[PDB]
Design an enzyme around this catalytic site. Structure first.
Site, PDB file in Angstrom:
ATOM      1  N   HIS A  40      -5.204  -1.843   4.024  1.00 42.07           N
ATOM      2  CA  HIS A  40      -5.390  -3.359   4.028  1.00 42.07           C
ATOM      3  C   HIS A  40      -5.056  -3.722   5.171  1.00 42.07           C
ATOM      4  O   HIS A  40      -5.403  -5.016   5.395  1.00 42.07           O
ATOM      5  CB  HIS A  40      -4.633  -3.952   2.954  1.00 42.07           C
ATOM      6  CG  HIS A  40      -2.864  -4.201   3.379  1.00 42.07           C
ATOM      7  ND1 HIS A  40      -2.030  -3.449   2.985  1.00 42.07           N
ATOM      8  CD2 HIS A  40      -2.467  -5.350   3.862  1.00 42.07           C
ATOM      9  CE1 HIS A  40      -0.902  -3.994   3.172  1.00 42.07           C
ATOM     10  NE2 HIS A  40      -0.945  -4.941   3.771  1.00 42.07           N
ATOM     11  N   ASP A  84      -3.565   2.806  -0.523  1.00 34.70           N
ATOM     12  CA  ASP A  84      -3.359   1.870   0.781  1.00 34.70           C
ATOM     13  C   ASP A  84      -3.186   2.823   1.957  1.00 34.70           C
ATOM     14  O   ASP A  84      -1.964   2.903   2.219  1.00 34.70           O
ATOM     15  CB  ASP A  84      -2.684   0.745   0.304  1.00 34.70           C
ATOM     16  CG  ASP A  84      -2.712  -0.324   1.489  1.00 34.70           C
ATOM     17  OD1 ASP A  84      -3.714  -0.288   2.120  1.00 34.70           O
ATOM     18  OD2 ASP A  84      -1.615  -1.117   1.332  1.00 34.70           O
ATOM     19  N   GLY A 175       3.938  -8.549   7.847  1.00 34.29           N
ATOM     20  CA  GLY A 175       4.151  -8.046   9.367  1.00 34.29           C
ATOM     21  C   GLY A 175       4.546  -6.728   9.269  1.00 34.29           C
ATOM     22  O   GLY A 175       4.409  -5.949  10.183  1.00 34.29           O
ATOM     23  N   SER A 177       3.780  -4.362   7.233  1.00 34.26           N
ATOM     24  CA  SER A 177       2.473  -3.747   6.258  1.00 34.26           C
ATOM     25  C   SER A 177       2.170  -2.340   7.635  1.00 34.26           C
ATOM     26  O   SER A 177       1.931  -2.823   8.499  1.00 34.26           O
ATOM     27  CB  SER A 177       1.278  -4.478   5.750  1.00 34.26           C
ATOM     28  OG  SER A 177       1.736  -5.116   4.859  1.00 34.26           O
TER      29      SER A 177
END
Ligand SMILES: [Ca+2]
Length: 223
Positions: A40, A84, A175, A177
Site C-alpha cells: 500500500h 500487503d 506514516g 506504514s
C-alpha cells in the site's frame, strides 16, 4: 507511533524512510540492496533514506539511494490489504556499518505473547496530528489470533497478525506504514493497517512476514 518513546539516533539500524519529496512510509533493510515495505506504500520515484534519525536534518549517517525497481506481491489486494508487502531494489548497494545494517528474515513465525519492537516516524497522537522529526519506538506483544479476529470480525487473514494493547493508548499510526515489527532480532511484521490509532479494542494489524520468506528469497535471487 502513539505512546512510544524516542528510540535514540541509529539504534534501529535497519529502519528506512521512503521519500518522494517527503517521508511517506517506513521500510526495512534486508540486505545491502533490498528493502521490504508495505504494498500500500507503492509509488513511482521513491528515494530510500538509510541511517536517518531526524528526517529533516542531515546529521551525518544518512545514505540516500534511489530505487531501481519495486515489486508488489503478486496477490496484493488493495481492498482487503491481504498480502500487503512489497520489495524495493536499490540502484546501488548501501554501505553497511553499526548504524546501517540489515535485519534478518525469520525461519519461524513468532507466537502470540512474544514482545516486539515497532518503529517509525508516524503520527504521535490518537486525536489530531503531530508528526515527529526523530524515530519513535514502541515495545508491544503479538496478540492471539482469537483476540485479533474478535477485534476485527471478517477482516483478518492468515497473512496478518495483531500486536499492541487492547486497552489502547499505544499503537502504530499514519506514516508508520511499511515499517518493521522485530521480535528477537528477526523481522516478523510490516506495519499495515488499523482502525484509527490507539483506540480501545483496535490494535494495529501487521503483515505476517514469516509467510513470505520463500517469495522474498526467490525474488531477490532473480532480480
Ligand atoms: Ca537526517
Amino acid at each position: 507511533i502513539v505512546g512510544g518513546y524516542t528510540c535514540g539516533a541509529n539504534t534501529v539500524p535497519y529502519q528506512v524512510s521512503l521519500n518522494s519529496g517527503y517521508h511517506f512510509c517506513g521500510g526495512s533493510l534486508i540486505n545491502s540492496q533490498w528493502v521490504v515495505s508495505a504494498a500500500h506504500c507503492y509509488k513511482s520515484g521513491i528515494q530510500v533514506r538509510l541511517g536517518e534519525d531526524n528526517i529533516n536534518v542531515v546529521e551525518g549517517n544518512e545514505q540516500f539511494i534511489s530505487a531501481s525497481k519495486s515489486i508488489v506481491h503478486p496477490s496484493y489486494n488493495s481492498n482487503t490489504l491481504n498480502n500487503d508487502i512489497m520489495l524495493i531494489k536499490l540502484k546501488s548497494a548501501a554501505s553497511l556499518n553499526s548504524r546501517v545494517a540489515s535485519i534478518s528474515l525469520p525461519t519461524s513465525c513468532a507466537s502470540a505473547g512474544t514482545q516486539c519492537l515497532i518503529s517509525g516516524w508516524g503520527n504521535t497522537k490518537s486525536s489530531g496530528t503531530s508528526y515527529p522529526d526523530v524515530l519513535k519506538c514502541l515495545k508491544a506483544p503479538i496478540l492471539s489470533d482469537s483476540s485479533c479476529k474478535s477485534a476485527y470480525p471478517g477482516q483478518i487473514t492468515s497473512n496478518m497478525f495483531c500486536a499492541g494493547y487492547l486497552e489502547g493508548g499505544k499503537d502504530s499510526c499514519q506514516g508508520d506504514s511499511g515499517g518493521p515489527v522485530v521480535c528477537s532480532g528477526k523481522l516478523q511484521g510490516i506495519v499495515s493497517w488499523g482502525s484509527g490509532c490507539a483506540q480501545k479494542n483496535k490494535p494495529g494489524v501487521y503483515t505476517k512476514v514469516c509467510n513470505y520468506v520463500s517469495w522474498i528469497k526467490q525474488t531477490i535471487a532473480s532480480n
